[PDB]
Amino acid sequence: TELKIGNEKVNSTNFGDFAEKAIRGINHKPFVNSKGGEQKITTSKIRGILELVNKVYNRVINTNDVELSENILADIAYIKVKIAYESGREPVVKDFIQRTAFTAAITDVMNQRTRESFLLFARYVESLIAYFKFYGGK
C-alpha cells in the first residue's frame, strides 16, 4: 500500500478504480497535437509499457522477501529512465504517462523499496492497460 500519485493515494484496494478514472480522462478530451490533435495512443505503445513492467513483475511475482533486492530496484529505476526517454519521443505517449501518473508510482516504489508496493504498482498498470481495452481498441 501507500502508493503516492501526486493528487491522491492508491492503496492496494484502489488501483482499478483509479486506472478506469484515468482511462476515462484519457478517452475523454483526446490529445491535442500540432494539427489540433487528435489521435490517441496505440495498443502497441502501451504494449511497451506493459512488457517493461512485466519484465520485473515476472522476476518479483515468485519470491518471499518483503523488500525488493538491489537487482530489482535497479530494473525499476531503469523502467523509470525508459519511460522518461520514450515520452520525449512522442507527445501522445507523454500525455498517457502524465494523466496516468506512472512516474510518481515508480518513484514511490523506489522509495518504499518493498515487494508489496511494486506489486500494487504493477497491478495498477495492468488494470490501466485492461481498461484502455474495452474502451478504445485498434
Binding site: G16, I129, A130, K133
Partner: peptide, 23 residues
C-alpha cells in the same frame, strides 16, 4: 480480507474482449 484480488478479477472481466454476448 485482502480485497485486491476481487478488484483484480473485476479488471480482468473488463479486460476480456472478444465477440460474445458482449459486456
Amino acid at each position: 480480507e485482502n480485497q485486491q484480488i476481487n478488484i483484480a478479477r473485476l479488471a480482468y472481466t473488463l479486460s476480456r474482449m472478444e465477440e460474445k454476448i458482449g459486456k
